[PDB]
Amino acid sequence: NIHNVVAEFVPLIMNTIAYADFIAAQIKTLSFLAYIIRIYSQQMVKGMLQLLSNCPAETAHLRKELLIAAKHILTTELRNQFIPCMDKLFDESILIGSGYTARETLRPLAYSTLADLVHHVRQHLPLSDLSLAVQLFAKNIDDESLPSSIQTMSCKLLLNLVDCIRSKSEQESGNGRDVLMRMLEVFVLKFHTIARYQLSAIFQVTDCRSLVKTLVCGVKTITWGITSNKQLQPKETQIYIKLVKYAMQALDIYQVQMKEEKEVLEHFAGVFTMMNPLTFKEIFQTTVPYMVERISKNYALQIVANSFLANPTTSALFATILVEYLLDRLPEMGSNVELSNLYLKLFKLVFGSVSLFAAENEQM
Amino acid sequence: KFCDQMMQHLRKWMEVVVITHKEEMKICSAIINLFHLIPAAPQTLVKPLLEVVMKTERAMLIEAGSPFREPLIKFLTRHPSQTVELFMMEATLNDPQWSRMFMSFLKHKDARPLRDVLAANPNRFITLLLRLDLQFQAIKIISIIVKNDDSWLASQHSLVSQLRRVWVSENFQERNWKEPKLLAYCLLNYCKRNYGDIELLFQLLRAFTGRFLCNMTFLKEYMEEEIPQKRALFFRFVDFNDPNFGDELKAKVLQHILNPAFLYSNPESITSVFITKVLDPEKQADMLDSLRIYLLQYATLLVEHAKLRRLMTFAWPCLLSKACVDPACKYSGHLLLAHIIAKFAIHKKIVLQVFHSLLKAHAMEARAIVRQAMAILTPAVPARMEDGHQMLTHWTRKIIVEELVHILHLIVQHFHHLVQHMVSAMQRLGFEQRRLAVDLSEVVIKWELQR
Numbered sequence A: 001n002i003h004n005v006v007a008e009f010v011p012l013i014m015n016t017i018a019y020a021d022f023i024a025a026q027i028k029t030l031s032f033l034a035y036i037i038r039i040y041s042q043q044m045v046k047g048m049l050q051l052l053s054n055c056p057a058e059t060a061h062l063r064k065e066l067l068i069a070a071k072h073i074l075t076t077e078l079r080n081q082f083i084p085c086m087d088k089l090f091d092e093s094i095l096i097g098s099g100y101t102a103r104e105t106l107r108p109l110a111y112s113t114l115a116d117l118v119h120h121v122r123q124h125l126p127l128s129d130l131s132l133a134v135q136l137f138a139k140n141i142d143d144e145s146l147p148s149s150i151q152t153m154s155c156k157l158l159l160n161l162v163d164c165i166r167s168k169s170e171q172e173s174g175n176g177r178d179v180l181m182r183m184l185e186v187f188v189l190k191f192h193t194i195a196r197y198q199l200s201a202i203f204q205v206t207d208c209r210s211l212v213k214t215l216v217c218g219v220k221t222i223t224w225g226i227t228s229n230k231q232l233q234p235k236e237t238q239i240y241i242k243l244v245k246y247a248m249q250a251l252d253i254y255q256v257q258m259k260e261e262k263e264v265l266e267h268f269a270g271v272f273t274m275m276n277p278l279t280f281k282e283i284f285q286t287t288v289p290y291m292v293e294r295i296s297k298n299y300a301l302q303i304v305a306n307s308f309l310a311n312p313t314t315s316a317l318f319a320t321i322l323v324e325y326l327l328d329r330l331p332e333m334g335s336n337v338e339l340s341n342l343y344l345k346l347f348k349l350v351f352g353s354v355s356l357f358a359a360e361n362e363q364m
Numbered sequence B: 001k002f003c004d005q006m007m008q009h010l011r012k013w014m015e016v017v018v019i020t021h022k023e024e025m026k027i028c029s030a031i032i033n034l035f036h037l038i039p040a041a042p043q044t045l046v047k048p049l050l051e052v053v054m055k056t057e058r059a060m061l062i063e064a065g066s067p068f069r070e071p072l073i074k075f076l077t078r079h080p081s082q083t084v085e086l087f088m089m090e091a092t093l094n095d096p097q098w099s100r101m102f103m104s105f106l107k108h109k110d111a112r113p114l115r116d117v118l119a120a121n122p123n124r125f126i127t128l129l130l131r132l133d134l135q136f137q138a139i140k141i142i143s144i145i146v147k148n149d150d151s152w153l154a155s156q157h158s159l160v161s162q163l164r165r166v167w168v169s170e171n172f173q174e175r176n177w178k179e180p181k182l183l184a185y186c187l188l189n190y191c192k193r194n195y196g197d198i199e200l201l202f203q204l205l206r207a208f209t210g211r212f213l214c215n216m217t218f219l220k221e222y223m224e225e226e227i228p229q230k231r232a233l234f235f236r237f238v239d240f241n242d243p244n245f246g247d248e249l250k251a252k253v254l255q256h257i258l259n260p261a262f263l264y265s266n267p268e269s270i271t272s273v274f275i276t277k278v279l280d281p282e283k284q285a286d287m288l289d290s291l292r293i294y295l296l297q298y299a300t301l302l303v304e305h306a307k308l309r310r311l312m313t314f315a316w317p318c319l320l321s322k323a324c325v326d327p328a329c330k331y332s333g334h335l336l337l338a339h340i341i342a343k344f345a346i347h348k349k350i351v352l353q354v355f356h357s358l359l360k361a362h363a364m365e366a367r368a369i370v371r372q373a374m375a376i377l378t379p380a381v382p383a384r385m386e387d388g389h390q391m392l393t394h395w396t397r398k399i400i401v402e403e404l405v406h407i408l409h410l411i412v413q414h415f416h417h418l419v420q421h422m423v424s425a426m427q428r429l430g431f432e433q434r435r436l437a438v439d440l441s442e443v444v445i446k447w448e449l450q451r
Helices: A003-013 A020-034 A043-054 A060-076 A082-086 A100-124 A127-142 A148-171 A176-201 A204-227 A234-250 A259-271 A277-297 A299-308 A314-332 A337-356 B002-021 B024-037 B043-060 B069-078 B080-087 B090-094 B096-107 B111-120 B122-129 B132-148 B158-169 B179-193 B198-207 B220-226 B230-240 B248-262 B269-277 B290-305 B308-314 B327-340 B348-359 B364-377 B381-387 B392-402 B406-414 B418-430 B434-450
Strands: none
Touching: A003 A020, A003 A043, A020 A043, A020 A060, A043 A060, A043 A082, A060 A100, A060 B327, A082 A100, A100 A127, A100 A148, A100 B327, A100 B364, A127 A148, A127 A176, A148 A176, A148 A204, A176 A204, A176 A234, A204 A234, A204 A259, A234 A259, A234 A277, A259 A299, A277 A299, A277 A314, A277 A337, A299 A314, A299 A337, A314 A337, B002 B024, B002 B043, B024 B043, B024 B069, B043 B069, B043 B080, B043 B096, B069 B080, B069 B096, B069 B111, B080 B090, B080 B111, B090 B096, B090 B132, B096 B111, B096 B132, B111 B132, B122 B132, B122 B158, B132 B179, B158 B179, B158 B198, B179 B198, B179 B220, B198 B248, B220 B248, B230 B248, B230 B269, B248 B290, B269 B290, B269 B308, B290 B308, B290 B327, B308 B327, B327 B348, B327 B364, B348 B364, B348 B381, B348 B392, B348 B406, B364 B406, B392 B406, B392 B418, B406 B418, B406 B434, B418 B434
16 A cells, blocks of 8 residues: 555656646645655655645635645655755745735745744754745734734744854854844834734733733843843944833733733843843933833833842942932922832832842942 | 134043043033034034044944933034035945934934935935935935924925835835835825825835835825825826836725725715726736725725626626636625625526525635625625525525535524524534534524514
8 A cells, every 4th residue: 555655756746837727636636645644765845845836826725725735744854854955945935825815814824834844944954044034034023914823923933043043153154143133123113013003902912912922032032142241232232222112112001901921021121131231231221211101100010120120230230220310300209199109119129129239239 | 722622622531431431421521512502613623523422432332322412413503514514425424333323413303403404405315316325324314304394395396206216116125124114204294295196106006015024004194194075086097097017916005095085985076986987997807816806896885885787897707607717806706796786786687696606616715705795795685585586595405415504504594494404414514513503593493483
């Protein structure tokens, strides 16, 4: 019975697109038989990737079956590693789910199937290819014509991709760092955009909470590669200044609807932690009056600030930025009852810092 | 003479603050503010202090919150003619580090006198506009001035044409990085001030080409703002369309903005619109995309929301088999039949044709269109079928005899030998499918209770 597999291997390599219904039916038939890979050269894969790019666009149902078939065949985990490199990543080209209804229906399947492929190919891919790859995923996260579900996982792979970008940049002369940020602008762009789209909130909450929860890790991890303690360039820093201003806006709707809140914010507070304190102290002084202003409408953000100076080198540097701002705000306390409590609460925790780590906080 | 001494002193102090880095900020900022207070200060002194400020800012690696900005600009705003020139030397522009500084000042509030000089010489921008790096700065300076002064650029002047000319041409360059959103800002404001008609057509034409990624909810504002009677006047040149190279994509997005406009309402111009619209098809259509889907549905809504024999020629290709090739538009073609059959186009011969077409060729992608089409058809035809021959059962009979049917059950839910059909088929399928089991059963008892 196994002779069928070798029997079915012959057509797969052949049957290129050198009579519309006949050819469409012919390609569909090969999709059905190619699904049965229970047994587990690469000749069959060569034709599959050949016809994968050559599939006519108007054949919506044919592409529907092909994409599902493409998902199944790539699960081999043995030869599925050869199809990406061999096909030169042509799938990254415009051939992605060509066809009107295919675009507006099966785009999530097309990107998701490729997402898993690059998920494992990550360690088996160079920097130059990754630069091409991330481009499509960068569009996915920001594009508003796609389901939010894929927008979340589009970052999930990017979290691991940047490490590969870092890895290849470490391995060879790949200009990863310049690439590493290019999506960071997209990441912050998402925040400024998400802040505007939270207005609908005033199931979507789960989507929004899930969406941001993915973003924080994505932005958090890239900083690891970006710094790899080393000082950060000025124009490079300005992106983060935008990040904090937009980020604090996003983390709002989750109090007028706490484990996750602390979880994400503590992850968030780390984004500015590992980077050089000298570049850090630059970021917040410009934005600290806003963040203190923002904390007034949502106390939960204080979990950042309090955790911000609760341990790392951030303590001494942030404390100076905080009290210096509060001191000039000191007259305001005692007049605006709603705001007066805020400054005192801020003053209480910073004084909590000096008690906590008197080393250089006493001096501060 | 005094200013020269401080100029020397500032530089010496400025070297110290960086030296200290590897009072100073206050001292250096204050002396810089001294130049603004003191009048009769030479214009030439801008270049010396500007360089050291630039030299130290890069040396100190700070650009935001640097104390030297605010006191510095106050001096520049008093002397904007020279500073713009010194920033407009070609070599200085080529340096991105120097280029960034120039824009930062143009953002500040005190630049309002400074930006007036730039607005006074539109010809200057055209020189840089008509490579990318040099061009990109030209876009930023153009957008920034308009950002504060919306009135400027509202004049019917060739400057928009120069942006328009390069605008359409250079969509392939993005295949600088932030130019698309930046460039669109200038023209959109111009369209906002005055209806650009054909000018508005071009920005939409390129709005979704060249692999752009930055227009989120930015273009849509004019469409919403376009409504706050204009459609009839706006539609006339749209029919012209002056394409000379256009494609379906351009028209597709063009009708997208119309749909909100036609959702506004309905003057007598609608009468001539119907005649004009039905003269478009040109018999042979080479568009095998959503253009037909958008165009066909758009015609249906406008006439009822706002000779008709010529309109039905549109659905003739989708009344046939080979014509209306793409099923996606074929479902939309049926969707058109549901809409057009609302007022007086109800005939038995065509009523049967559309009804099975919805259930025939069931698919998930078809489910969306047929579900939408069925909603319009459900109050139109089934009433005739209810008083007619109850033909819905015949097709339901055909499918079960052959051997999927939930679509008919959904229609029947809105609407007695059939009762056995749903019960008989569902129980076998039930062995998910649990959804339609309960809903129809409740109607089954209600229908039995009623009669």
